[PDB]
Design a protein around this ligand. Structure first.
Ligand SMILES: *[C@@H]1O[C@H](CO)[C@@H](O[C@@H]2O[C@H](CO)[C@@H](O)[C@H](O)[C@H]2NC(C)=O)[C@H](O)[C@H]1NC(C)=O
Lengths: 50, 50
């Protein structure tokens, strides 16, 4: 190549570590117990759980 | 008497330079993989600004 000033590839500072945070001691949702419930609603009155 | 008045004439402007693939696809590798098959789009923008 010729003589000149070249603006080269963009660099980012690479991340050193990770900061992972959660909430400890939470209950279990138990969606499998609601799905395996005995009574099953019709499509006319479908059911919702939050 | 002798009057005096001032006048500004603009001879330059700020020299803006643009990193095209850092503007478009900042740090994400899938973006750079999709951008690499656009050919010579970023090189023309850098050449016009130079
Ligand atoms: C399956 O769903 C029924 C909903 O009809 C649940 O019955 C409710 O049970 C709770 C406590 O277990 C009672 O406080 C509610 O009053 C009941 N609902 C009605 C309409 O009476 C039943 O518990 C579910 N099964 C399981 C294993 O959780």
């Amino acid at each position: 190549p010729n003589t000149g000033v070249y603006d080269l590839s963009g660099f980012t500072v690479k991340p050193v570590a990770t900061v992972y945070r959660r909430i400890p001691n939470l209950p279990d949702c138990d969606i499998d117990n609601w799905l395996n419930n005995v009574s099953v609603p019709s499509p006319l009155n479908w059911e919702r759980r939050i | 008497t002798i009057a005096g008045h001032e006048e500004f004439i603009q001879t330059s402007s700020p020299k803006v330079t643009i990193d095209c693939s850092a503007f478009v696809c900042s740090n994400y590798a899938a973006c750079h993989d999709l951008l690499s098959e656009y050919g010579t789009f970023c090189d023309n923008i850098n050449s016009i600004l130079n």
